[PDB]
Design a protein around this ligand. Structure first.
Ligand SMILES: [Zn+2]
Ligand SMILES: [Zn+2]
Ligand SMILES: [Zn+2]
Ligand SMILES: [Zn+2]
Lengths: 78, 78
DNA sequence: TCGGACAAAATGTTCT
DNA sequence: AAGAACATTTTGTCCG
């Protein structure tokens, strides 16, 4: 299937969302680093397999908007 | 006479013909030496500043060329 | 699914 | 100034 963030091949539902392993780990690192990324464009960068490295701000924004959340399994269990 | 012409960080000298910081110097060398088949995720006018210069190597390399960076600056100069 | 360990890629600094 | 070595950061895969 397809990662909902970067369109690469997805490796499961991570943190609530069908995503590839690279996006899974990017997301956990972003949340736990509480990094404050800034876009160099217009907050609408193309995030695909090549370009996902280019804008961590837009990649992270796509993660969050797709509904990724570290407590996804904890919420869904409930 | 103080600022990197590519990213606006503090320049360290006049490298490959242009006033630049050390990071832009070696970024340009690596880009020319090798391949630079970079892809912009924006509209080819990414802002290249001290933080964001890492986001888009395509626009960073474009700004190096536009500023006139070239490997044989010192030969050409002589 | 999740995350630790390891590895690769990409970037940046020292040069006593 | 330019470049090799060294070093760090950022990203991605392998395992369990
Ligand atoms: Zn992805
Ligand atoms: Zn962006
Ligand atoms: Zn610079
Ligand atoms: Zn760009």
């Amino acid at each position: 299937h397809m990662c909902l963030v970067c369109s690469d091949e997805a490796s499961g539902c991570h943190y609530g969302v069908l995503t590839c392993g690279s996006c899974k780990v990017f997301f956990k690192r972003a949340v736990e680093g509480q990094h404050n990324y800034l876009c160099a464009g217009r907050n609408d960068c193309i995030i695909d397999k090549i370009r996902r490295k280019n804008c961590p701000a837009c990649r992270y924004r796509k993660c969050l908007q797709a509904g990724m959340n570290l407590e996804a399994r904890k919420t869904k269990k409930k």
